[PDB]
RNA sequence: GCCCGCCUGUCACGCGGGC
RNA sequence: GCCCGCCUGUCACGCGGGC
């Protein structure tokens, strides 16, 4: 229900209809979601509807990926924001890599509680 | 220089790489370009690159068509979105007619400032 | 009340693929 | 037709939240 970790997932990994997908979009949203104290190293946001993402946690749109992870059946518009400069202290300058691929998540009680953020270091 | 009418021309009439050419695309882009309040009667979008469209104002890709208007030499992929109910008030339902034909524009300072939208009343 | 989100029903459209 | 997928709208209830 009101699983705080699910809602923490959305704060850090969900933006339904992004208003941009450049570095500015990252630097704005990475601050709006509180990830700029200290600068979070890298963070990916998923776009689209929420039901598609929750459905990953069940058979409709999900498959077993690893020890405690699940891979989505369909691909998602996503944006990955990576910190550059080498300074953990804000200003938290970012560079954006938008993409389109399947996402990996951990699930608890049919809910995404974490994003496998590792697959997005690679692009 | 003052390029503001060209800037409105692109916002109202240009989508380089449309994401569909069906009713969904129309209703999506008519909302995305803010044209839905009230519902614009009809509005046509041009696809392709900008230079082809600017060239209608020079002899490279244009000829005098009628009064202060010019017809393109080449044809364009275009999509015309027409309103469905007739009520200018939302919801703004649109039906799409994709086409491939010459476009007519008025030109100032080598730039399209208006589209002759009448030719698209004819499907 | 206005807005956003969740969830359900009901009107209903639109596109693509496989068989 | 059937399956899979994408993408949306109207209206009505219910729940959470902002004003």
Residue numbers in the entry:
A (entry chain B), B (entry chain A): 1 to 123
Tell me what the authors wrote about this structure, in their words.
Angiogenin, also referred to as RNase 5, is a small 123-amino-acid protein and a member of the bovine pancreatic ribo­nuclease A (RNase A) superfamily. Although it has been assigned various regulatory roles, its core catalytic function is that of an RNA endonuclease. Angiogenin from humans shares a high degree of sequence similarity with the eponymous member of the superfamily, and the catalytic triad consisting of a lysine (Lys40) and two histidines (His13 and His114) is conserved between the two enzymes. However, angiogenin features a unique C-terminal 310-helix and its B2 site is occluded by Gln117, which is locked in place through a hydrogen bond to Thr44.
